[PDB]
Every structure is written in C-alpha cells, then in structure tokens.
Amino acid sequence: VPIEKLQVNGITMADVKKLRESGLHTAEAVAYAPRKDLLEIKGISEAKADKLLNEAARLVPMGFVTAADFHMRRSELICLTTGSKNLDTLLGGGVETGSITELFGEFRTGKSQLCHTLAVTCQIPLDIGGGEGKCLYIDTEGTFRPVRLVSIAQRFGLDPDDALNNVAYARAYNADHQLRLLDAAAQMMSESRFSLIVVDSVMALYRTDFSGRGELSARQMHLAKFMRALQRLADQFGVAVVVTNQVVAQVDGGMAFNPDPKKPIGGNIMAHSSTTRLGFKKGKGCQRLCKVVDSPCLPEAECVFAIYEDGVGDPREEDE
Amino acid sequence: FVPIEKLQVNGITMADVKKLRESGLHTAEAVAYAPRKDLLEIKGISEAKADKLLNEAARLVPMGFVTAADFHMRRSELICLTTGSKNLDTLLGGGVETGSITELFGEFRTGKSQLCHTLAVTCQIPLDIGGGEGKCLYIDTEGTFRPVRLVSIAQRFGLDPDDALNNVAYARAYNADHQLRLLDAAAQMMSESRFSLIVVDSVMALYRTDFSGRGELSARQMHLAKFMRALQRLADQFGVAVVVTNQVVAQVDGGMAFNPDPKKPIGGNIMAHSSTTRLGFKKGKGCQRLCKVVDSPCLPEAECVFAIYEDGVGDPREEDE
Amino acid sequence: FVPIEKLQVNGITMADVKKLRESGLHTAEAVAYAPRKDLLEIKGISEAKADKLLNEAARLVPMGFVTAADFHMRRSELICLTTGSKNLDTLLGGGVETGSITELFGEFRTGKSQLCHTLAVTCQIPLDIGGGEGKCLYIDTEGTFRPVRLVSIAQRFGLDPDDALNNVAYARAYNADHQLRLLDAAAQMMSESRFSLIVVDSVMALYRTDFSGRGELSARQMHLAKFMRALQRLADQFGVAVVVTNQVVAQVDGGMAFNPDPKKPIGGNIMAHSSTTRLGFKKGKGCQRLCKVVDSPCLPEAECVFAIYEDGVGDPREEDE
Amino acid sequence: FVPIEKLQVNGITMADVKKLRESGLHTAEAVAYAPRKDLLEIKGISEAKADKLLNEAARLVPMGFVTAADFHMRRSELICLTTGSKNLDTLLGGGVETGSITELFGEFRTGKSQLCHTLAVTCQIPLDIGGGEGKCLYIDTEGTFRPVRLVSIAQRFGLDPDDALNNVAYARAYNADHQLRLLDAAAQMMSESRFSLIVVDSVMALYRTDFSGRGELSARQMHLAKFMRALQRLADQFGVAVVVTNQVVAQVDGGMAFNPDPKKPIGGNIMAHSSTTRLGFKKGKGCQRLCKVVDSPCLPEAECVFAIYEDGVGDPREEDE
Amino acid sequence: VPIEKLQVNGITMADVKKLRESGLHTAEAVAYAPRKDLLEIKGISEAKADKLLNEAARLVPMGFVTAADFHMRRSELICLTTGSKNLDTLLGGGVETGSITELFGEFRTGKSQLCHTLAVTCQIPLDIGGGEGKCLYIDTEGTFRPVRLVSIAQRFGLDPDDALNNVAYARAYNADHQLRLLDAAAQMMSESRFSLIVVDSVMALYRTDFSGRGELSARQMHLAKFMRALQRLADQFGVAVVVTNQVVAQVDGGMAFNPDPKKPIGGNIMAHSSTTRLGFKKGKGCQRLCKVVDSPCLPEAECVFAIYEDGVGDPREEDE
Amino acid sequence: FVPIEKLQVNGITMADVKKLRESGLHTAEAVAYAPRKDLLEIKGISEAKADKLLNEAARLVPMGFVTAADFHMRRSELICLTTGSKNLDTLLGGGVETGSITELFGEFRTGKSQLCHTLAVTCQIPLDIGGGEGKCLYIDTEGTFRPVRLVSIAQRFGLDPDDALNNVAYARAYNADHQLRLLDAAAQMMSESRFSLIVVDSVMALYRTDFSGRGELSARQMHLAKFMRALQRLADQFGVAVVVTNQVVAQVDGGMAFNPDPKKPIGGNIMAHSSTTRLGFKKGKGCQRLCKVVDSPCLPEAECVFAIYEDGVGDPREEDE
DNA sequence: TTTTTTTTTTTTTTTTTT
Ligand SMILES: Nc1ncnc2c1ncn2[C@@H]1O[C@H](COP(=O)(O)OP(=O)(O)OP(=O)(O)O)[C@@H](O)[C@H]1O
Ligand SMILES: Nc1ncnc2c1ncn2[C@@H]1O[C@H](COP(=O)(O)OP(=O)(O)OP(=O)(O)O)[C@@H](O)[C@H]1O
Ligand SMILES: Nc1ncnc2c1ncn2[C@@H]1O[C@H](COP(=O)(O)OP(=O)(O)OP(=O)(O)O)[C@@H](O)[C@H]1O
Ligand SMILES: [Mg+2]
Ligand SMILES: [Mg+2]
Ligand SMILES: [Mg+2]
Ligand SMILES: [Mg+2]
Ligand SMILES: [Mg+2]
Ligand SMILES: [Mg+2]
Ligand SMILES: [Mg+2]
Ligand SMILES: [Mg+2]
Ligand SMILES: [Mg+2]
Ligand SMILES: [Mg+2]
Ligand SMILES: [Mg+2]
C-alpha cells in the first residue's frame, strides 16, 4: 500500500515527505512503526502522529483474523525456487517470501551461490517458482559475482541484460552503512516491485565493527535493529529475505554431544530473528548438504544439492 | 465470567458501559480489578460514578477473603490444557493450568512455538481428553505462526481442519504498542465468545528492538509490566490459560560459573515475577526436547523429555530412544 | 580513488584531515567506509564534525545502490595480475583479481612465497601483458623475503632489476600488533603513490605464537578479523590486489577420514570467510606444484599444475613431464 | 644490534631495563619485536610505560617500510658461514645464512651433528675465509656434543684448539621447558659478547618424550612454535645463523607412492614453516653423505654430495669416489 | 647429589618421599624433570614445584658453560674396558659412561657376551679400565647367565662371590614392567654406587607387547619414554648404558647399495636415542666383527674380536 | 608356580579369576607377566581392577631386582633334562635346560623328532637320572609323531609303556591360528598337573604354508613372535623345558660362500632371537648324527656325535665307528 | 537489564625366501 494514501484528515504532503525521509515509505511502514518512533521524527506532533497511526490502521488491517483466513492467505504466498528440486522439497516449495531465511555455514558451502541462484530466480515467471520481481542484493564481503547471475539466467532463459538490470546491488562497508542501506531499499521498493532481499553476509561487518565483550551488547542491539528493519521490509513488501551467516568452531568441549563444532554467528539475536535457518555442509566435490535447523513448519530434515556453473541444481548421477 | 452489562443498575446508564468497553474494560471482573484511578482516567465518568461502579462490581464479583479449603476446592475443578505429551502433562501436573501465565523460555528450535500450536489445537478438544472446549487466541510477534501445524495437530486429535482453524483467532503484533493494544481486542472478543487459551509468541521480541539502550530500559520494563498486568487481568476475567514464549540471552559474565547453562530468559525481574510458571526448553537428540520447570508455586523443579513430530508435540518414540 | 584532500568543505578544516590521516584514514574512501563510532574514537572529532565528514564522504564516494549491470561492467575492466603461468591464469580466470583478498594456503615448499614474489614482479609490468603498472607492497612475517627472486623474475619479464627492486616496498612484521600497524603505513604510502599489490606472507605466522592457549584464542581471532578487515578496506580503497599466504594444520581428528587431505589452513573461520579466493597448494614431482581453488565466489573448484623455476612461477615444461 | 641500555630515555629508569633483562629481553630489538601484551606481562611495567618503550624502540630500531633495493643491498653484505665443504657452500649459495633458521633433518649418522660442529668451528675463523668472527652457542639435547670434534676441526682450520673451545658456549637441555629457558641465557650472553651461530641439536628430541599422545600434541606444537619464534627473534636481534637439527620418522601411511623417501622430518607444520631453510641428509657410500635442499625461499631444490672426515665436514675425496 | 638436599626453603620430607615414590631419587632427576612431570605428582602444588625447580637448578648446574670445561669433564670421564684391546681401540678407550651404547646385530654375534664382560669389568679397578661400581643387568630375553660372569671374574681376578653380589639382576616380562624396572634401578643407584646399566634386549618385549600397524605409534612412544628414562639415568648417575637391539632383515631390495640386509629394531627412535651404535657380525669361529654405525666422535671403522670361555677378548693367533 | 586362585584378595572375585582363565591366563605368574594393555582388553575387567590384579601378582610373584648370586643359586637348582646321550648331555652342560626355549634345527631325518620323542620319555624318569618327573606336552604339526618310539624309549629307560604313553599330552596343530590357540589349552592343562616339557615339532612348518608372499611375511613373523612369546611365558610360568624343532632352507645366494653350510632355519630373526638355545643337526655316517650349538648364552660353540637307535637317542657305539 | 566468542594439532616401522 502506497504511503501517499495517508494524505487525509489534515495530513499534508510535508508530513508524508518527512516520513519518507525517515525511512518509512509505505502505509505498512507507518502502521508497524511504534508511536515513539513517529514522535522521534522531527516536525511531527503527538496528535498528528496519532491520526497517522489511525489512518494506517484503517488502511492496513492491524486487528485479529481467523486462522483459516491466514492459512488461505499463506496458501497464495509466493515461494521462490532455489534451482534444486531436492532443496525445494526440503523447504516445502522453496524460499518463502515475507519471512527471513538464514543460510549459515562454513566457506564454499554454496550460501553465496544459492543467493545468486535466488537472485536470478526471483525474476522468472511465477509458474516456474519465480517471483516476477527485481532482486535487491546487499553485499558485505565483496563476494558478489555478476558472471554467476549471467550463467544462471542463461540456465533459466532470462536475458542477461534484463537479469543484471533487475538486480539491485549495494556494497556495505560498515554496520552503520549496512543498516542505512535498508532505508534506500525501502525507497526503491516503494517505486518498483521487488521480490527478494539478500544480505551476504549480515554478521561479517558486525564481527569487526564491534570488538570485545564490552561492545558485544551494542553489537547485538544493532543486529536486532537490523533484522527488525529486515522483518518490517518483508512484511511491507512481501519480499523473501535471505541472509547468510558465518560460523565459528565451538571451542568449549563440554557439549561433546554435538557432532558439529560450528555454530552460526549473531547468537540468540540472529537465532530468534531468523524465521528459517538452513545449515550448509560440504559434500563430495560439488555436493552440498543443507539441513533445516530452525523452521516453524518445516521438519528438521537434510537434503543434498550441488553447485554447477549454471547455479545451484540437483546432484547429478555422474556426481554420485 | 460476569458480563459488564449487568452493571447497568442503580442509575448506571448504557453510555457508561459503552465508555468502559471503549476503554478496554469488557467484563464486570475487569471493572472490579480495575483501580479507581484507572476508572477516573476514563472520560465521562465522575468520582461518584466510578465508586458506584466499583461497589457494583464488588457485589457482583467477589473480592473479599475466602478460606483456603474453598480456594482448593475451586482449583480442583480448574481446567488444565493437555500439551499432547504424557511426560509434559505429568511434569506440569495435568497440563497447562488455566487462569495463570505460563512462560516457555528456551533456545531456538526448542519447541516453544510447536508447543504453543499444540496447545492452540488442544484448547478446542473436549474436556474429557484434557481440552478446554474454547477458541484459541494466538498473538504472534515473530511472524512464525503456521496454520499447517494446526491442521496437522487437528488431524492427530481428530478435530476438523476448518473447525480448528476457524476457532483460532490470529493477530500479528508489529510493535510493543500494537502488542499491548491487541489485548483490548482480545478482551472484546472474549466478552462475546468463550475462549480457552492466550498465546503471545513472543512477548520480548518486539520489546528488544522497540526500546534500545540503557536509557530506554526503564520504559521497556514499565511497558512489559503493563502488558503482563493486562494479561493477568485477562486470565483472571476469562479463566483462560495464558502461554507466553520468551527468547534467551547468553549471560556474558562468568561469575555464576555454578550454572552449567549460560542462557537466561529475557525481561529480567519483571519477566521472572510476572510469570506464574516458567518452563526452560532445551534440545535433545533428534526431535527430542528437554523441558525443565524453573519457577512454579506448586510444581517441583524437575525435567522431562518430550519430542516434536509432524502431528505435533508428543512423547518421544521408542525408535527415537 | 578519491584523495582525502577533497574533504576540506562545509566547515571541515585541514587539521581535521590531519587527525584523520594520523588515525590511519588516508583517503575519502577510507573515511566513507569507516563507521561513525570509529570516527568518534579519533581525538579532536566531535559528533557533528564526524556526521558531516560522513555526509561529505558519501557524497564523494558512491555508497548507494547500483544496478548489477553497472557492477558487471565495472568488474569487466577490473585489472587481473598474471601469475606467470598460463595454467594458473586460466584457473583464476585471468590471474589474481585486484580489489579482493586472494589466499594461498599450503604446506612448506609449495611455492606460496615464490608465487608472491612472481606477483610482486608482475604487478609492475604493463597492463597489456597482465600487469598492474603499480608498485608492490610486500609484508613479510617469516623472514623469507628474497629480493634475488625478484631480480630473477624481473629479468624474466624484461623489467629493469634496479627499477623492479625500487618499486617493491618491503616491511617485516615481528609481532601481530606490528603487522596490523604496518597497514596504516601501507595506506599512507598508497595515498601518495600507485600500488597494485599487497602481500602478507604470512598472515597467521605471527598470531600462532603471539597468542597461545585456548583462552587466548578469542583475542587472536578478533585481532585476525580486524587485520583482514583492514586489508579488505585497503583493497576497496585503492583497488589493490591483496595476496595472503597461510600455513596449514594437520587435522588430528581421524574420525572424519572421508577427506583424504589431513591438512587444513590456519585462522579457522575468520581467515576462511575473510579471504575472497582460497587456493590450496600441494607439491608435485620435483618443481611441479598443484593449485586447487578451494573457495571462490565465481571460479569453479578446479586443480591445475604449475612449476617453480629459477625465473619465477611458470608453466611446466615437457622435459619435467 | 642496538643495546637495551639505549632505552634509558624519556623517563625510563634503570629498574625498567633491569626488569626487561630479567624477562628475557636484552636488546632494543628484543623490546621492539615483542608485542605490547608481552611487555604488559612483565611485573612493574605500566601500559603507558609499555607504550613509551615501544615508541623508543621503534625510534631506535627501524620498523617501517623499506624499498626492496635497500633490503637487497643489506642482504648482499650478510655473512654466510662456510660449512667446510665447497659442494655444500655452492648448494647453499655461499654457506649457512646468518639471521635465518637453517634446519638439518635426516636419518641418523647422516652428519647433522658433525656439520653443526664444523659450523661451530668455522663461525670463529675470519670472514674472508667464510667465517663469522664470533662465538658459537651450542644447545645440545641428545648429549651428542663432542669437543674432540671441535678440536680436530679447529686444527684443520688453523684455530687454536684452546681458543676454539673457549669461544663455544655449550649448554645441554634436559627438558623442553629447560630447552626454551636456555634461550633467555643465550640472549643474555649474546648481548654481552659477539656471537655468530646458534645450534639446537636437536630441537624435537626432547619434545618426543616430554609430550606424549595426541592429547598433549597441541601443547607440544604450541611450545615448539614458541621456541622457534624465540629462535627467530634471536636471529633477528643478533644477526646470527640459527642451525637446528631435526630427527625424522618413517611415515607409516604409504598411500602416496610419489615420494621415494619414507622418512619425513619431525615437528609437523610448525617446524616445516618455522625453518627458513630445510636440508635433508642421507648417507652415501662410506663417509660420503647426501644433502638436499627441501625448502628454501631462494635456493633451488638440488642435491650435493659431501663427506664426514676426522677433521670435519668436507668435500668427498677422489680416492673415495 | 642426593635428593635429600632439596629439603630446604620449606620443602618437607613428605615432598621428597612423594618424589621418590614417583621415580625421582636424585636432585638431578628433579632438575631434569619438566614442569608438567612434577605437576603430575600428587601432593605437589604449582608454587611447590617451581620452588623445587629453583632449588634443583641451584644444586645442579643447568646454565651455559664453555666448551673447554666440558672437554675437561669428558677427559676426566670414565670409560669401561670391554676386555678386548681391539674393541677398546675402536671405541676410543672402551664403553663411554653417561651415554647410551647400542649393540645391534644378528644372533650369536656376542651382544649378550659383551654385556656380561662389561658387567664384570664395571667392578674391576679404574686403572685397568674398570668402573669400580655395581652392575645393573636388565634381561628381557632370559639369556642372562651368571656362569659367564663367574668365568670372566676368574679371567679378571675378581672374587666370584663378590662379582655376583655386585650385579643387580631383574628380568622384564613386559614393556610396562621393563619401564617400571627403571624406577627401582634409580632407587638402587641413589643408595649405592653403580657404573653400568644393561638392557638385553630393549626391543624384544616391545615387538610382541605391541602388535600390528595400529599399535606401532604407541610402541614407539613407549620406547621413546624408555630411552628418555635411560638417558636420564645416565645423566644422573654417570653410568654407561649398554643396550642390545635385535635385527630384522629388510625386505626392500631396491636399496641394494647397502651390503647388509639386516637393520636394528626400533627404527628412528632407537637410531636417534642411542649415542653410539655398534653393528655385530660373526667372523671365523669364535671371532666377531664389530662396526661403529653411529657415533658423534668415533669414525666409522670395524674391528675383529672373539668370544672365549673367559669372556670377550681379542682374537688369538691360533684362530688366525 | 603360584596358582591363579591366590589372587582372590582385595575385592577380586571368582568372576575375575574365571575371565582370566578363559583369557589364557591360568597362573598368577601369567597375570604378572601380562602387560596392562593385555589385561585391559579382557572383557569385564576395569582399569582399577587390572591395576589391583597387577599389584597382587607383583606381591605374589617377585618382579623386583635381585642379586646375581641369588640368580646363580636358583639356576644351580634348575632342572636339566637328559637327552639319553652322554655326548649330547656334555655338549649341553647336563642336558636340555628347563625354563628356556631350546631350538633343534637341521636337515630332514637328522633326528629332531627322534630327539623330541626321547626328551618326551625322559621328562618322566626320576630326577636322579636326569629326568623331570613331569608330564610331557607334545604339539605335533607335521604329523610325524609316533607313539611306538615313546614305547621303545620307555622300555629302554624302564618306564611302564602305558604310563609313559598316558603321561604325554598330544595336540596336533592344523594351521597357525590353531597352533597358537593350543598354547592356551597347554597352560590350562599345566595349571592342573605338573608338566616338565613342551615340544612343538615343528614351529614353522605350518607358518610356511599358511602365510605366503612378501605381503604376508610381516604378519607371518609377527604371529611367530607372538607364538614364541607365549612359549617363553609358559616356560617362565611352569619352569618347563621348551624344545622346538625347525626345518632348514638352502641359501640360494652363493655370494656368502664363506659359510660352508648353505642351509639356514626358517623363521629368520624372530626364531633366531626367540630361541634361547639353537642346535644345528647334521646327518653323519650310518645312524650317527652331528649336533652343533649355534646359539647359546653360556654353552660354547662345539659339536658332538650322537646316533639314533630303536630304543631312542643314544651315544654311538664302537661297532658303529 | 544486557549479551557471545572462538581453533589446535602429528605420528610412526616392518620383515624372509629357496
Ligand atoms: N562458476 C562456478 N562454477 C562452479 N562452481 C562454482 C562456481 N563459482 C563458485 N563455485 C563453487 O562455489 C564455491 C563458493 O561458495 P560460495 O561463493 O557460495 O561461498 P560461501 O560458501 O557462502 O562462503 P564465504 O563465507 O567464503 O562467502 C566454490 O568453492 C565452488 O565449489
Ligand atoms: N512440521 C514439522 N514436523 C516436525 N518437526 C517440526 C515441524 N515444524 C517444526 N519442527 C521442529 O520444530 C523446530 C522449530 O521449533 P519451534 O518452531 O517451536 O521454535 P522455537 O523453539 O519456539 O523458536 P523461535 O524462537 O525461533 O520461534 C524445527 O527446528 C523442527 O525440529
Ligand atoms: N661359555 C662360552 N664359552 C665360549 N663361547 C661362548 C660361551 N657362551 C657363549 N659363547 C659364544 O657366544 C655365542 C652366543 O652369543 P650371545 O649369547 O652374546 O648372543 P647374542 O649375539 O647377543 O644373541 P641373542 O641375544 O639375539 O640370542 C655362542 O654362539 C658362542 O659362540
Ligand atoms: Mg559466501
Ligand atoms: Mg525460529
Ligand atoms: Mg517462537
Ligand atoms: Mg614461504
Ligand atoms: Mg569465499
Ligand atoms: Mg646428531
Ligand atoms: Mg620455507
Ligand atoms: Mg644374546
Ligand atoms: Mg647418534
Ligand atoms: Mg621325515
Ligand atoms: Mg620333525
């Protein structure tokens, strides 16, 4: 819902412009934002903030709804194909839009490759598992490679010029810039239809920007704010949020029950903010193992997928 | 419960009840538990009218002393919602107790949301099998509600999927203020139809981000205290079980090395004191999960092993052992 | 890049830029990439001054969104440094990529230092033959730097040995703190002259002994992450290719016998994720060496054979086959 | 080198220098190379005092970037110790290089100890005949030191046997901790008189038995890395050749058939990467021995034949061919 | 020096008793023992172990020393005659005390006979190449024969009763028992002057106690510990350690340049641990050939010696 | 010897002694001689239990040092078994020594089996005439055992033929594994009755065919080493003479022509070092045989002439000269 | 009230044949 519909009941265009300058670009943005956030924006009075909230609640349903209606709505929710039938079956149709999907794993585990595949598939038509929308790739490690997008578009029949023109790239150099890029992301989606957000990787910049136990609380608070903004973006625009996470080896030997000594970065903030968490492990050569660690609906299962020159695909017989 | 419309006596008009409903008070119990200052804050109500309403609620809703034997007799017939697992029901002494706030805190994929879905389904099954015979009211703050789980658990328990879904009221809270405001609508709907369960998954998720830093910590704790005061008022009014999930944080300080678990529930003292029962959830092998009673006025501190399956929360299978 | 001497606008004085240079930020890209908190930690910089410095840096250096087509066009003209071996260049898709950290990990005598010397010589040859047309910057931690190799490779590639030696900046790191501090001097040198290569041979040699024990490991990896972040910042600012060598560790856990290679690179996940491209080096027969692309965002996992010669890294001859 | 007494400036008292010497740092280079946290571990030294010491050491000892031509002309005048055999000197490009750790690994009776004795004698002969004009420092861990060999080699080279013996500092290490602690006394002696050679025969012999099993393997290799770092620091400070002998173990896993040698040096990757130059020793016919340059940053992988004689290590004779 | 001298600076008799129960019977043993070895003894704390180390360093010189002083000390060192002038000339005066001498060779090559001769000669006066100390014979093959000692004592004029009473015999039945015997050896040497340790043979028990490729690493680790303990005993008491090693016929015929197809057991551990290694071969009749394979100071040379009823001696003219 | 039942002290029950009995350990001496690792691998035995068993065995069986005078006195009382020939007894210094492994290697039909039969008969005759007064245990592997020889020799020595026959324990080995397993039954039998001789004719006949090729040579010799170790354990435990026969192999390699005898026994160094005494057997004129002491710790290398007769092994007569 | 982290590290022979 466009934010311009709020220009009613004494709400002027200046108020909408000020809200847009503060990172709120849709009616859902005003509806989800708390009253204190509106008050923190300069030039907004308490009464006019209250009337903005009332108008947003009238435009965007904030009340209760039967679970049957929510199930029917989620049945129409778009799922983005990952390019692998095994992975789509594991995810119950692919990457779910409107929810944060976390891909945590060690290096060469295909997280960036899967993100590139998702970035290409977000543009293919809906009938083949696409999203029919532009991608928005947030890169924090410098590991984005448009050659991969060109190859995957060749696999999926997309025009390489059209495929590259429909992928939004911004390189994040620090945690503050990474969070600030979400305002530009919201502004871009308020003008054109997007279908996917990728932040590869979320925790790369937070690792170095905040160092030591003294800044750990600030680091996790900033990460919580960042995924709060990501979840709000997913709610407003219905876009799939795919985030990659680095891992660290658990140096404590007390929990020897766990055969995997590596855990994702971000701690409980990352753990609880992500709707779906996928653990990636190395297979034999191109083989990669994906394990659903956390998911409200998907059972904890493991599937095998492979990385090829044309993107993420199902393992081949010769590779078995 | 006693409907608020019964207060229209001794000169109390319909407009007063309308204003009370607009102020979030939908039952006579709500008026009885509401302090006089809260009634005075409502426009159109004078001091004499406020005290008259208080006296009417007092003579309609008992507020005096009762013998411990009478309270024990009343609690004996209190409904306990089955959790779908015999081990968990034994740990809780019959399941989730209605009329009290039950807190489920633990690490991720520990089954808090799955247990909440199982409780949402079982609140509709007949009382003879540990049900509640009432609608569920699910408040989701993390966007993790999945009606497919409700359908699967209803198939497990024999409930019709359409009936199960139509009897579960779902609302997603996007901020702390909206999370608190949803309770007024919850009370309004409960004043019209019988409910049997309140779920807030999760309470702390929106507060961790809406209030940031030490400066806003006091405001966050005050808002959380208000939210749990409203939840406790709802539980007292409607006798509905309140199940709340809580995320965890890793305690950086290593001073309390005597505790093998470096994870503690979020919310601090307000969270600890507001919850009648707190259950700590840990991951076992495979689908198995460990539930531990951390705080309870009557349940001893003990641990039980339960598992999460496609049909919902249940006891671990022999093949999983 | 954008020189830092363009920041004296909108009330920003030259003295503020002087403190910025003293803090290790020598380019407008450097202050653009540095977070607000890092600017605030510099003495003599206020909140408003740091904010306006950030705004000016963002105006000068594009930090906003850009279409992937533009990024592909920009990367098409990106300079790739030839390694002196056609097989290795084909494996790397043109050679060592500038602006990204390339990691060469392997056991001893596998040619990591030899390949770094070859890259240090080839970074000065003209662009038409795979060069960089820029001075090299060699950071050595094991004391294994040998200018005789540079002279031999320069005679191989036609460079004047005196000019080749004069165009290589060498500094030996004696401790991890000194190794990190050397990057400030590297940035200062690059802010006044064009540099086309960074070599850190080796990154983890000094952290291995500076930090000892499991308890000291966290500080070691935090310092390593800071060092790699600084290297990535240098590569982003100056478009300079960063080539880092890493030693190996034998994996004592024999349960995971599925992997035939018992040697893994040092640094753990910090070095693993910080490096854009990782190349695994193994010894062949005699001069032959095997290079394997363990990790790369765009290069497929493939293995090639290259040899170490008196004149540097080159393709194996049929006589050695 | 720069004596540590030059640090008595800018408020640094004699007590600070005494504590530094007691902590094992006996030169200004030792203070410069040591990290800040290493200085913090010394009692009686504050953080500000450590920063001042680091600044003064960096002012006295150059630590910044230097052009490769300057480093090349500095290494041109570097002293190489003759091994008594022209074949071995040609293989090593002039002899054993000072300021770098040279490793002599091989099977028994292959001449490692004999070559170390020859180097110990030649380090005292004048420079023009390939000497070092400095005292030797022999650290023996197997009890195989034999002054009779030194006397014979001195008679071969014309040195006075009494003078040759008086110029060799002998210390036997009985445990790994004592082996590491001997380096502090070595540095203390070196800061007082000009030395030109350090011999540790052998480095790993004490580590074989001091640490047993895979449980202590990590601690064993960490201690070995600390010992080798300390040796590298000593070489950097005093500009002396560090010659270390290493035992070998026959590799059981014969999976790789490309290596005709079933014996590999002990110490793993720690010793493989710590040693600047590695020489593999094998027995030839009679007194003849085979030396192979396994690892070297500047020397090609080649083999030469040398022999062990009663007067020391020398080239094989025509009668022995 | 006796370990009782460590009872200073607050070190009690209980500490010395615990050290003696742990196999450390001399202050030299405490000095040579590492920090972790001292920490493994119950009843000894961090500060207590450190204080013991400083006291031992004060008593036992552990610092540097000029090579001239060590040369003088080795010049005044005692060398045990082997009863054969040729063998003594080959060894440069006889078996060197304080160093491990390894006698490896085929069967009936004279290793056990030479050990018996050394056991007898360790008691004869110094002026005739003796040691004036008791022998310590550790037998692992059951090949010890006191009749040989009696005959050699008759050759050298010693009283057979005195000769037998001055030889400490203990038969090792397993590798663990063989290693444990060294603690009793140290205890006996701490109270009486010994001059020779014989282990015949070192590798006989290790061959069968550890079997298969999997147990080879543990076998060689235990062997390294045993040889380290032998070297510690030699350093502490200044006694000659004469050990016999059996031989195995190497099957790799590619290295045909070596005319000898038999190599000693123990591999590199025995190769490096032994200060001096002597290869024994049979000559004409009673004559035997001894070859110095490894020695830090003796040239690689061969001499011919013979075995007679009265012990090891030079070959006779009648046997030539 | 000390029976294993005496270990039933300090918490050692019947179960432990039994589990030892099926583990091949039937005496306290067997427990003492067995290493700790061998005790640990036995099922039902804990580390503390194994340590307690070791301490109890050490208390019962003296494992400490002892003066050579005491050893000589004990060996003076050691039993020697007469071979029926004065020449052979004089060559062996009284006959076959008990408690030691005596090897009889020679050409076919040189009397090894006949001498073993004679020893089997003489081990039962009274001690005053060189006997052993104990049962014999014959392990025949070539199938050449003939009880008629035992009957004839018993007639020669005056023993009752039935008493001689039923006092000889026979067990025929069909493969190497069965040959090794038979020693456990031998120990079990000897723990029940007094034995005085063990005969294995022949040791390496079965190993020659069971293991073939270079690959199985290592396993063959390792199994042979285990077998002879067990034989030595039996000899130490029961004080019995172990007499083993071995075939011969002609040395095809004629380069070592210095040895007039081209035949050497099978088993190589394992049999060479495991056998306490080795006797070389050659065929003389007629029925006379030549016996030569090849290896013996105390017997000088000498030869004697003995002959084989119907009544057994005896000295040659004048008519045979 | 708060709020995670983060890898190490080799080893070690063997064993006759006809
Ligand atoms: N063009 C390609 N063709 C085939 N396989 C490729 C190609 N590019 C990359 N790969 C594969 O993908 C791997 C790289 O994985 P990816 O780029 O997804 O990183 P990641 O696992 O997320 O790790 P990081 O933490 O380092 O970013 C390579 O090692 C290779 O196996
Ligand atoms: N349909 C299903 N069938 C079986 N198991 C499931 C299913 N859906 C989820 N699970 C299991 O439950 C886990 C998710 O638990 P749940 O959704 O209750 O989260 P939670 O512990 O409350 O955490 P969060 O804080 O992320 O909401 C999954 O990881 C999986 O193990
Ligand atoms: N009393 C003796 N008189 C003369 N010579 C003897 C005497 N005892 C033994 N010999 C000689 O010594 C040889 C035995 O050698 P020795 O006992 O030293 O064995 P070894 O070579 O160490 O072998 P191993 O321990 O492997 O059996 C006999 O073969 C013989 O030549
Ligand atoms: Mg990636
Ligand atoms: Mg979740
Ligand atoms: Mg949840
Ligand atoms: Mg190198
Ligand atoms: Mg990568
Ligand atoms: Mg040596
Ligand atoms: Mg090297
Ligand atoms: Mg012998
Ligand atoms: Mg040696
Ligand atoms: Mg026959
Ligand atoms: Mg026979």
Ligand SMILES: [Mg+2]
């Ligand atoms: Mg023998």
